[PDB]
């Protein structure tokens, strides 16, 4: 809505910037601290800035809005030697196109979005178990035997009771059928009896792309034609399978384990053998249902039969599989130990299927050049627990990232705060620009600031949030981390995180970039300094800081003295950018003088927490 970034470039770039349409900020390594803060605050959009910044730490620079573009790998600071956020290729200076240069920034900026949500997420996996509004990404980095991953994924093309299909959605190519299979089914298994594994090329390429989960899992594999695979998490079996006893003897029963049954069995005049193969793969899974957690039975569709039967939880189309591949994979969820509770997905039963409706599924969703987006949906739907965030009442501690402010939740505002009163970590869209690849809606920043802050609950904007994590848990959140602060500043973030002792004015907390331009607009438009300053912050909705702590920082902390208060900075390894209650109490008042109803309680809460402290 207001928040910008300083697109910082290194010397050799500068000349081309001049030729742009955005404001340029020039340095000049002196510049006091309180110099940057007043200048940077003049820029109501993104800026370009160059020249010497040796004096300064990174935190200092990110709180200011910095993104480090250059041709060189890194740039020298006072803190450390930072990895440039945005490297430019030589040739694409160089050239000296302002446009290809400006485009080049954009892309990496959208790529930078990732790193931001990787820090918050990567902290959540540190402090939590339950998990809400999740997706493949969160599955991807989860520990399936600890974190418990809920959410509401977008349900794929399915056949059971039960039809509905389609409709079609846009999609792109992926990994060939057989490794694109493994990819979505393998997640929480611990042991896999892979029946009919062929020559193993399949599973090896699975290793070659997805190495972690290949090793975090155990593979019995079965074929007349399977070679000796030197791997030690691979016990091979040449034995062909007619009975469930050719698997059974090869499971340790004295210990609990999630086990997965994968069937893929084909041989060599009609073929109602193709049939009683699949049907067998099913019966064998079934008899064992109670030792496996689930199964992916192969399921090709016959010509002869218009309708037929099978045991099924689901039947679905196959990513990366050719268009003419007339073969669905049949899921069976089962009973048997599993670190993911799937009792939503119905207990695999007998299923009447109509060939032509399967025939249609293949027709709609198969294609070499389709699957990517299907596979995802399958993955989630299979392994996420279908549970609604604002409604789930949890016993364990719980994280709430990047779903909260979704357009489907619109109106249900109260429930939202309820979640941010008690989550470990959660985030709300508060950005007021156009604003794309993002389908969220904004919460009023004042209302966030005021409802957000509780003793335990620290309420910062994404950048503050990050700065904080850098500063408190330096190795949950690295310092060299690349991210785009502007974007970080579209999110309100909340953490179950105690106030510092002593409540130092760290950047995580105190930035207030542009608060002077912010105070003037305020006064030409809707007109009514630590008294007025608090009011500005609120009325602007430019800002999201932790009211509570910042309160505590003012009264309980300043005074203290000159000597005795920096000192307690050293120490708390804090850092700043800027070198009584009766103000604040009116600050509040004035605020709600202008805002009956559109708020604020609460307010009342805040006042009555000064008038008692």
Ligand X SMILES: Nc1nc2[nH]cnc2c(=O)[nH]1
Which residues would be at the binding site for ligand X (CB under 6 A)?
113-114, 116-117, 136-137, 140, 183-184, 375-376, 379, 402
Tell me the closest approach of the beta carbon of residue 405 to ligand X, in angstroms.
11
* 8 A C-beta contact, residue 398 and residue 132: yes
Cβ burial, residue 470 (10 Å; 0-12/13-18/19+)? buried
Which CB sits closer to ligand X, 113 or 581? Answer: 113
Which CB sits closer to ligand X, 258 or 440? Answer: 440
Which CB sits closer to ligand X, 481 or 534? Answer: 481
Question: What angle (nearest 5°) sits at the alpha carbon of residue 122, between those of residues 119 and 126?
Answer: 135
| DSSP symbol at 89 | P
Q: Tell me how far CA of residue 316 lies from CA of 30, 183, 193, 354, 366, in angstroms.
A: 65, 15, 21, 14, 10
DSSP letters, 330-376, are EEEE--S--SS--TTS---EEEEEEHHHHHHHHHHH--TT--HHHHH
Tell me the closest approach of the beta carbon of residue 439 to ligand X, in angstroms.
10
| Spatial distance between the Cα atoms of 353 and 429, rounded to a whole number of angstroms | 45
Tell me the closest approach of the beta carbon of residue 179 to ligand X, in angstroms.
10
Which CB sits closer to ligand X, 184 or 222? Answer: 184
Tell me the closest approach of the beta carbon of residue 136 to ligand X, in angstroms.
4
Which CB sits closer to ligand X, 132 or 237? Answer: 132
Tell me the closest approach of the beta carbon of residue 376 to ligand X, in angstroms.
4
Which CB sits closer to ligand X, 404 or 420? Answer: 404
Tell me the closest approach of the beta carbon of residue 401 to ligand X, in angstroms.
8
Which CB sits closer to ligand X, 159 or 379? Answer: 379
| Spatial distance between the Cα atoms of 542 and 1, rounded to a whole number of angstroms | 7
Pairing of strands 398-400, 425-429: parallel
| Spatial distance between the Cα atoms of 3 and 486, rounded to a whole number of angstroms | 6
Sequence-distant (6+) residues with CB within 8 A of 438 are 429, 431, 490
Which CB sits closer to ligand X, 134 or 508? Answer: 134
Question: What angle (nearest 5°) sits at the alpha carbon of residue 523, between those of residues 519 and 528?
Answer: 105
Q: Which helix (H) or strand (E) holds 471?
A: helix 462-472
Which CB sits closer to ligand X, 50 or 402? Answer: 402
Tell me the closest approach of the beta carbon of residue 118 to ligand X, in angstroms.
7
Cα atoms found within 13 Å of the Cα of residue 169, Cβ hemisphere only? 13
| Spatial distance between the Cα atoms of 194 and 216, rounded to a whole number of angstroms | 16
Which CB sits closer to ligand X, 143 or 520? Answer: 143
Q: Give the residue carrying structure tokens 């389709």.
A: 370
Pairing of strands 81-83, 74-76: antiparallel
3-class DSSP state of 264: coil
Tell me the closest approach of the beta carbon of residue 140 to ligand X, in angstroms.
5
Tell me the closest approach of the beta carbon of residue 512 to ligand X, in angstroms.
23
3-class DSSP state of 222: strand
H helices within 233-272, ranges in order? 245-248
Which CB sits closer to ligand X, 112 or 420? Answer: 112
Helices then strands, counting H and E runs in the chain, come out as 21, 23
Tell me the closest approach of the beta carbon of residue 484 to ligand X, in angstroms.
8
Tell me the closest approach of the beta carbon of residue 144 to ligand X, in angstroms.
13
In the bound state, the residue with its beta carbon closest to ligand X is 117
Which CB sits closer to ligand X, 375 or 511? Answer: 375
Structure tokens at 161: 């009771």
Which CB sits closer to ligand X, 135 or 546? Answer: 135
H helices within 27-148, ranges in order? 33-40, 58-62, 98-127, 136-140
* 8 A C-beta contact, residue 527 and residue 585: no
Sequence-distant (6+) residues with CB within 8 A of 319 are 174, 175, 177, 180, 181, 184, 370, 371, 372, 374, 375, 378
Tell me the closest approach of the beta carbon of residue 130 to ligand X, in angstroms.
18
Tell me the closest approach of the beta carbon of residue 483 to ligand X, in angstroms.
8
């Amino acid at each position: 809505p207001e928040p910008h970034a300083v697109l910082y470039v290194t010397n050799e770039l500068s000349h081309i910037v001049k030729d742009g349409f955005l404001p340029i900020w020039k340095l000049t390594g002196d510049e006091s601290l309180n110099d940057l803060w007043l200048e940077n605050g003049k820029y109501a959009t993104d800026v370009y800035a160059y020249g010497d910044v040796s004096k300064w730490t990174i935190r200092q620079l990110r709180g200011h809005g910095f993104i480090f573009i250059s041709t060189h790998k890194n740039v020298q600071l006072a803190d450390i030697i930072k990895t440039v956020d945005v490297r430019i290729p030589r040739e694409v200076a160089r050239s000296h196109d302002m446009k290809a240069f400006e485009n080049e920034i954009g892309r990496r900026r959208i790529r930078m979005r990732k790193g931001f949500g990787d820090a918050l997420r990567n902290y959540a996996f540190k402090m939590a178990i339950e998990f809400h509004g999740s997706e493949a990404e969160t599955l991807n980095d989860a520990n399936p035997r600890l974190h418990k991953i809920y959410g509401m994924p977008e349900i794929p093309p399915l056949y059971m009771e039960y039809a509905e299909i389609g409709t079609r959605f846009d999609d792109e190519p992926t990994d060939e059928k057989l490794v694109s299979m493994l990819d979505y089914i393998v997640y929480s298994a611990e042991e896999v009896h892979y029946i009919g594994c062929g020559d193993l090329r399949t599973l090896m390429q699975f290793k070659k792309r997805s190495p972690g989960r290949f090793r975090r899992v155990l593979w019995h594999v079965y074929d007349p034609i399977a070679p000796e695979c030197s791997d030690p998490n691979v016990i091979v079996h040449n034995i062909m399978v007619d009975s469930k006893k050719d698997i059974l003897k090869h499971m340790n029963f004295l210990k609990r384990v999630e086990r997965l049954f994968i069937w893929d069995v084909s041989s060599d005049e009609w073929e109602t053998t193709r049939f009683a193969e699949d049907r067998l793969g099913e019966e064998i899974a079934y008899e064992m249902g109670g030792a496996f957690s689930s199964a992916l039975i192969k399921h090709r569709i016959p010509n002869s039969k218009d309708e037929y039967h099978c045991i099924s939880t689901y039947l679905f189309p196959q990513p990366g599989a050719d268009a003419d591949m007339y073969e669905l994979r049949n899921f069976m969820r089962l009973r048997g130990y599993s670190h993911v509770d799937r009792h939503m997905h119905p207990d695999a039963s007998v299923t009447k299927v109509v060939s032509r409706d399967v025939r249609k599924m293949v027709e709609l969703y198969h294609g070499r050049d389709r699957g990517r987006f299907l596979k995802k949906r399958l993955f989630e739907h299979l392994h996420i627990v279908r549970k609604n965030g604002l409604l789930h009442e949890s016993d364990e501690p719980r994280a709430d990232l990047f779903y909260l402010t979704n357009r489907c939740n619109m109106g249900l505002e109260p429930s939202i705060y309820e979640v941010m009163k008690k989550s470990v970590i959660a985030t709300a869209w508060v950005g007021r620009a156009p604003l794309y690849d993002y389908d969220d809606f904004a919460l009023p920043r004042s209302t966030v600031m005021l409802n957000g802050s509780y003793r335990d609950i620290r309420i910062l904007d994404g950048n503050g949030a990050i700065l904080f994590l850098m500063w408190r848990y330096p190795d949950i959140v690295k310092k060299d981390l690349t991210y785009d602060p502007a974007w970080a500043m579209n999110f309100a973030v909340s953490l179950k995180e105690p106030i510092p002792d002593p409540p130092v004015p760290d950047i995580s907390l105190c930035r207030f970039i542009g608060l002077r331009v912010e105070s003037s607009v305020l006064r030409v438009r809707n007109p009514t300094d630590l008294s007025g300053h608090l009011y500005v912050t609120l009325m602007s909705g430019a800002y999201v800081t932790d009211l509570f702590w910042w309160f505590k920082m003012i009264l309980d902390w300043s005074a203290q003295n000159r000597e005795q208060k920096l000192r307690d900075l050293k120490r708390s390894a804090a850092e700043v950018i800027e070198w009584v209650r009766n103000d604040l109490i009116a600050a509040l008042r004035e605020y709600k003088r202008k805002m009956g109803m559109r708020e604020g309680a609460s307010i009342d809460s805040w006042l009555e927490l000064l008038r008692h402290l």
